[PDB]
Amino acid sequence: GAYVLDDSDGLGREFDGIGAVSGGGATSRLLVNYPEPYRSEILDYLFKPNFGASLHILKVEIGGDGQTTDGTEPSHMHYELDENYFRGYEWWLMKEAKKRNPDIILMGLPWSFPGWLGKGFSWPYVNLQLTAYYVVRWILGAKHYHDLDIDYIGIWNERPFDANYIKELRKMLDYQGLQRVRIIASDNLWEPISSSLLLDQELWKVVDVIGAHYPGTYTVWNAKMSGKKLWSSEDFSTINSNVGAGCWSRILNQNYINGNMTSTIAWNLVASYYEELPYGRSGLMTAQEPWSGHYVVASPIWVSAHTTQFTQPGWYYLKTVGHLEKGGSYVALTDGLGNLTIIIETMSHQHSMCIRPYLPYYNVSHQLATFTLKGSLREIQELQVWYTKLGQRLHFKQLDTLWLLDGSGSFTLELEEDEIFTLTTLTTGRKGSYPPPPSSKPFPTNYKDDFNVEYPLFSEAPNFADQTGVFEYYMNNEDREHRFTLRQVLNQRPITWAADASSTISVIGDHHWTNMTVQCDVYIETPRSGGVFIAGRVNKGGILIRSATGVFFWIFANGSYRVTADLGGWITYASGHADVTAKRWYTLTLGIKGYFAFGMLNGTILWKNVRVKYPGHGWAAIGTHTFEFAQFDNFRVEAAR
Ligand SMILES: *[C@@H]1O[C@H](CO)[C@@H](O[C@@H]2O[C@H](CO)[C@@H](O)[C@H](O)[C@H]2NC(C)=O)[C@H](O)[C@H]1NC(C)=O
Ligand SMILES: *[C@@H]1O[C@H](CO)[C@@H](O[C@@H]2O[C@H](CO)[C@@H](O)[C@H](O)[C@H]2NC(C)=O)[C@H](O)[C@H]1NC(C)=O
Ligand SMILES: *[C@@H]1O[C@H](CO)[C@@H](O[C@@H]2O[C@H](CO)[C@@H](O)[C@H](O)[C@H]2NC(C)=O)[C@H](O)[C@H]1NC(C)=O
Ligand SMILES: *[C@@H]1O[C@H](CO)[C@@H](O)[C@H](O)[C@H]1NC(C)=O
Ligand SMILES: OC[C@@H]1[C@H](O)[C@H](O)[C@]2(O)CC[C@H]1N2
Ligand SMILES: [Ca+2]
Numbered sequence: 175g176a177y178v179l180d181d182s183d184g185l186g187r188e189f190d191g192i193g194a195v196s197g198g199g200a201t202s203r204l205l206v207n208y209p210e211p212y213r214s215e216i217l218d219y220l221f222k223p224n225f226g227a228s229l230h231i232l233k234v235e236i237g238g239d240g241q242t243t244d245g246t247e248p249s250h251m252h253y254e255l256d257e258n259y260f261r262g263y264e265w266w267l268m269k270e271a272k273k274r275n276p277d278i279i280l281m282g283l284p285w286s287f288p289g290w291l292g293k294g295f296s297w298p299y300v301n302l303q304l305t306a307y308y309v310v311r312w313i314l315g316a317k318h319y320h321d322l323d324i325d326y327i328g329i330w331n332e333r334p335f336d337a338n339y340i341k342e343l344r345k346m347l348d349y350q351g352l353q354r355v356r357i358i359a360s361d362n363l364w365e366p367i368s369s370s371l372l373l374d375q376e377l378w379k380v381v382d383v384i385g386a387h388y389p390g391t392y393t394v395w396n397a398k399m400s401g402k403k404l405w406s407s408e409d410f411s412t413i414n415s416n417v418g419a420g421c422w423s424r425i426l427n428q429n430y431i432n433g434n435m436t437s438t439i440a441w442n443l444v445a446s447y448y449e450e451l452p453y454g455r456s457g458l459m460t461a462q463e464p465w466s467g468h469y470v471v472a473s474p475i476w477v478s479a480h481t482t483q484f485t486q487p488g489w490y491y492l493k494t495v496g497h498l499e500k501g502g503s504y505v506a507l508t509d510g511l512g513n514l515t516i517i518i519e520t521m522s523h524q525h526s527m528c529i530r531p532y533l534p535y536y537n538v539s540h541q542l543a544t545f546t547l548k549g550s551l552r553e554i555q556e557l558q559v560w561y562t563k564l565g566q567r568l569h570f571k572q573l574d575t576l577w578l579l580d581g582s583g584s585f586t587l588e589l590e591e592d593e594i595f596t597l598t599t600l601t602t603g604r605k606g607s608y609p610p611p612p613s614s615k616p617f618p619t620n621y622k623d624d625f626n627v628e629y630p631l632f633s634e635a636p637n638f639a640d641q642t643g644v645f646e647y648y649m650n651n652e653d654r655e656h657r658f659t660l661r662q663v664l665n666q667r668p669i670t671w672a673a674d675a676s677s678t679i680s681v682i683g684d685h686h687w688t689n690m691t692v693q694c695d696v697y698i699e700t701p702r703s704g705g706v707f708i709a710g711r712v713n714k715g716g717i718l719i720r721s722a723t724g725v726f727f728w729i730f731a732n733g734s735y736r737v738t739a740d741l742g743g744w745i746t747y748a749s750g751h752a753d754v755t756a757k758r759w760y761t762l763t764l765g766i767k768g769y770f771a772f773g774m775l776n777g778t779i780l781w782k783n784v785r786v787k788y789p790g791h792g793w794a795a796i797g798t799h800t801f802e803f804a805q806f807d808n809f810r811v812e813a814a815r
């Protein structure tokens with residue numbers, strides 16, 4: 175089989191870049207507290223040009239205080255009249271990406287919204303101008319406080335759009351001088367956004383990109399008819415073993431070949447969240463042990479580099495792309511300056527399945543591929559070669575240059591299965607390398623945080639991964655013993671993306687912990703009705719946080735306590751009266767060992783030898799009975815795995 179690569183009959187679509195998502199939700203949570211140099215090395219593998227994944231696009235969640243898959247992410251407006259552009263870690267992340275690549279493209283998209291935007295309903299389209307005001311303030315703050323230009327704004331992640339909202343968002347953007355910001359919709363399925371654009375000229379004018387999720391490499395006729403740029407604005411979401419690398423390799427090529435999609439964006443950027451949370455280890459690489467510094471440059475990093483190091487937003491695909499006779503595919507791109515990049519993939523069915531969708535079997539076998547360069551491409555006589563074999567494996571290895579000196583403008587490759595080749599005229603490719611990082615280590619079995627940081631770099635203490643509610647460093651000047659605490663700051667349920675719990679909760683530590691003693695000072699702010707807890711063996715979080723079981727030691731401001739097996743509190747281990755009121759500091763201790771637990775109030779036994787389910791394992795946790803203010807101090811955990 176010969177394959178003509180040519181440009182004399184014109185180009186295909188403009189290539190818009192490869193990127194990844196930080197957010198939906200708290201996927202970068204454990205990255206912020208990596209020590210140096212590791213934290214910076216990780217960021218280089220992701221964003222430094224001509225090094226690792228060298229990503230063209232960074233998309234981040236616009237935190238809305240709700241649970242959005244592996245945690246919550248804090249909003250810039252927790253309450254009406256509240257504005258704070260320094261919470262969370264997406265600002266930091268975007269700035270670190272821009273430091274390494276000042277041409278990186280930036281995107282924001284909400285998953286959840288603060289509850290007050292709903293005006294009494296869990297719905298963000300009650301007051302269109304109010305919701306658009308909220309979103310636009312985020313884009314303004316990105317520029318005013320971090321010198322970040324947000325390139326694209328989305329609507330509501332995998333949730334219904336409102337056409338009047340999209341029009342209001344455009345009008346509000348323009349009113350604030352943000353004409354440069356483009357709109358992508360609707361970050362869900364091809365429909366109903368695609369037909370809506372064909373039926374509504376005014377909507378068509380204000381939507382710049384149709385972004386679909388997990389499209390299985392195909393699009394639909396209405397989207398082609400729109401004439402809009404089509405993007406796989408969220409894809410991948412597969413474990414970053416070699417099979418995830420294969421999935422990513424295949425769809426990177428075939429999203430354009432099969433579906434006219436000129437950008438693909440992987441969820442997620444880096445797996446910096448506890449692996450036992452939903453969809454664990456589904457990032458382009460792995461960085462989930464800030465305590466140890468261990469990170470893994472997983473195969474998808476080098477699959478990315480085969481495209482990103484050798485294309486840039488603003489190149490064009492050739493019209494001459496397609497599938498290989500015996501399985502796999504090729505794309506080809508130029509920059510209009512005489513450069514050419516050819517990206518070939520032979521991913522086998524068995525080693526490249528994504529979680530969404532699963533493809534019916536297709537065959538891949540050994541084959542020869544002849545490539546002939548016609549048009550303006552006949553005059554090139556030299557190609558750098560980069561090669562990857564997935565499976566023991568060889569990653570992003572540079573082979574000896576290929577020469578086309580015989581004037582036939584033609585060359586031939588022997589392809590097997592699960593291979594990637596990049597043939598390019600660019601000489602700038604590099605398999606970036608840092609020395610290996612520390613070995614993997616479990617979460618420390620003795621761990622303490624007194625939260626005594628006067629000017630913290632991030633708005634929350636390290637390693638606490640909020641799963642409902644939002645927990646923050648808090649300074650109380652009018653108190654000496656508890657001047658620096660950790661406070662739960664939501665006072666009403668968000669407009670939720672997930673099924674957030676009815677109680678707030680932040681989990682920490684080692685999911686495999688089975689015997690443990692958790693201690694924490696707690697402070698209930700709401701008189702009469704308020705309540706807090708500490709917990710151990712918490713076995714589920716993320717979008718499953720409502721499912722979490724464990725051992726939960728609750729105290730309440732009405733003078734009572736409960737011990738439950740579930741966060742929902744449907745299953746009782748023990749309960750009784752306790753000398754507990756609001757607005758007083760108490761020390762809670764919870765001991766769990768084998769079949770039995772005990773609890774202490776101020777170092778005095780409140781209950782003991784209470785039988786609990788065993789075997790069982792899970793994180794330690796803190797939280798509050800509803801969406802209510804409460805403070806925590808002097809946290810300690812000793813645990814056995
Ligand atoms: C979108 O991509 C498709 C292919 O995935 C383009 O489709 C036709 O594809 C066949 C074989 O795949 C070619 O023989 C035709 O020449 C293609 N059509 C045209 C008009 O050239 C399709 O053109 C693309 N749509 C765009 C770019 O709007
Ligand atoms: C291939 O791409 C390189 C990188 O853009 C091109 O080189 C640049 O060319 C522009 C003008 O076209 C200069 O202003 C830059 O200083 C060059 N930079 C580098 C790093 O070379 C190159 O012209 C393209 N074409 C070929 C055949 O290499
Ligand atoms: C957690 O504690 C339980 C309860 O003490 C441990 O289980 C006991 O282990 C000893 C020796 O390993 C056995 O002789 C007992 O019969 C076990 N008791 C029960 C009820 O199983 C368990 O090994 C501890 N696990 C860790 C990781 O420390
Ligand atoms: C795949 O194709 C090769 C060559 O045609 C053939 O020998 C092999 O049996 C096929 N495998 C399957 C599972 O169809
Ligand atoms: O595969 C899970 C993905 C991840 O959880 C992202 O948050 C999401 O936007 C919501 C579901 C899907 N896309
Ligand atoms: Ca303190």
Ligand code: NI
Binds near residue numbers: 450713791
């Ligand atoms: Ni488990």
